[PDB]
């Protein structure tokens, strides 16, 4: 009765208002890239280090 009236009115006479996906973007965190592979670069290459180390600390094992 009143149920029917409400049902009728609600469904028919107004529905969803406008709302854009674009506007949504502002309110969410957007995807961004995982920049950089982050290559490590070789350290201590060559016997330059070795000659340095042999000479530098001469402290013997006790």
């Amino acid at each position: 009765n009143v149920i029917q009236d409400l049902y009728l009115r609600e469904l028919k006479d107004t529905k969803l208002a406008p709302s854009t996906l674009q506007d949504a973007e502002g309110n969410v965190k957007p995807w961004n890239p995982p920049q950089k592979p982050n290559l490590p670069e070789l350290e201590l290459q060559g016997p330059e280090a070795l000659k340095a180390y042999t000479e530098q600390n001469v402290e013997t094992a006790h």
Partner: protein, 85 residues
């Protein structure tokens, strides 16, 4: 980072401790040791090395060569008394 190389460098533990010094002494000394000595000197039979053998041994503190040697001088001058008298 890679472990450093100190543990494996040993050549300053070869003078690094004091018994290295003692070692280089007794690797020579005891190596050049004889089992027993060369000889102690006690006799040689020059006929007075025998005097040493009976009297002047390592363990002979016995007064006998002194007595004998004293008596020798007594025999010497006593004859010389009769050379002058």
């Amino acid at each position: 980072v890679s472990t450093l190389i100190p543990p494996k460098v040993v050549s300053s533990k070869n003078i690094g401790s004091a018994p290295n010094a003692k070692r280089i002494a007794n690797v020579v000394h005891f190596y050049k040791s004889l089992p027993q000595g060369p000889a102690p000197a006690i006799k040689a039979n020059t006929r007075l090395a025998r005097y040493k053998a009976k009297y002047f041994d390592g363990d002979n503190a016995s007064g006998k060569p002194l007595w004998h040697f004293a008596l020798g001088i007594i025999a010497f001058g006593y004859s010389m008394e009769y050379y002058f008298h």
